[PDB]
Amino acid sequence: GSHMEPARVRCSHLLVKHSQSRRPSSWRQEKITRTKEEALELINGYIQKIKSGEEDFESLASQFSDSSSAKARGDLGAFSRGQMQKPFEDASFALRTGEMSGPVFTDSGIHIILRTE
């Protein structure tokens, strides 16, 4: 449980679009043909690889993420409350230091939350 309230939290994020997304295009893909489930498979794939030791969230959040933060390894840096979407932000505070959350469904699509701090 959360035994402390931090005003500064650092979390990295990964995002994969889906067919029902508002923007069916990205800075890497021309059209998002993959739906929720197809994107979810990728999400779980990334997570499994990281937990196994195949790769680290750095490469996934950079070369396998649509998040603009991908250029910075997918990290958002140290942010505060009222800075990110509630499902993500509230989850970040709920997570512990060094915790990688699973598939979190948000506006854009499925998000992976890695709370480093």
UniProtKB/Swiss-Prot annotation:
EC number(s) from the headed UniProt entry: 5.2.1.8
Consequence of changing S25 to D/E: Loss of peptidyl-prolyl cis/trans isomerase activity, nuclear localization and cellular function
Subunit note: Interacts with STIL. Interacts with KIF20B. Interacts with NEK6. Interacts (via WW domain) with PRKX. Interacts with BTK. Interacts (via PpiC domain) with DAPK1. Interacts with the phosphorylated form of RAF1. Interacts (via WW domain) with ATCAY; upon NGF stimulation. Interacts with PML (isoform PML-4). Interacts with BCL6. Interacts with FBXW7, disrupting FBXW7 dimerization and promoting FBXW7 autoubiquitination and degradation. Directly interacts with RBBP8/CtIP; this interaction depends upon RBBP8 phosphorylation.
Species name: Homo sapiens (Human)
UniProt-reported outcome of changing K17A: Loss of peptidyl-prolyl cis/trans isomerase activity. No effect on the interaction with IRAK3/IRAK-M. Abolishes IL33-mediated increase of IRAK3/IRAK-M protein levels
Keyword Isomerase: yes
Role noted for this protein: Peptidyl-prolyl cis/trans isomerase (PPIase) that binds to and isomerizes specific phosphorylated Ser/Thr-Pro (pSer/Thr-Pro) motifs. By inducing conformational changes in a subset of phosphorylated proteins, acts as a molecular switch in multiple cellular processes. Displays a preference for acidic residues located N-terminally to the proline bond to be isomerized. Regulates mitosis presumably by interacting with NIMA and attenuating its mitosis-promoting activity. Down-regulates kinase activity of BTK.
Gene Ontology molecular functions: beta-catenin binding; cis-trans isomerase activity; cytoskeletal motor activity; GTPase activating protein binding; mitogen-activated protein kinase kinase binding; peptidyl-prolyl cis-trans isomerase activity; phosphoprotein binding; phosphoserine residue binding
Enzyme class: isomerase
Range of the intact protein held here: 51 to 163 of 163
Chain's gene name: PIN1
Domain statement: The WW domain is required for the interaction with STIL and KIF20B.
Annotated localization: Nucleus; Nucleus speckle; Cytoplasm
UniProt PTM: Phosphorylation at Ser-25 by DAPK1 results in inhibition of its catalytic activity, nuclear localization, and its ability to induce centrosome amplification, chromosome instability and cell transformation. Ser-25 is dephosphorylated upon IL33-stimulation of dendritic cells.
Catalytic reaction(s) noted: [protein]-peptidylproline (omega=180) = [protein]-peptidylproline (omega=0)
Domain named PpiC: residues: 6-117
Record-listed Phosphoserine modification sites: S25, S62
A Gene Ontology BP annotation from the UniProt entry: regulation of mitotic nuclear division
Tissue: Expressed in immune cells in the lung (at protein level). The phosphorylated form at Ser-25 is expressed in normal breast tissue cells but not in breast cancer cells.
Protein name: Peptidyl-prolyl cis-trans isomerase NIMA-interacting 1
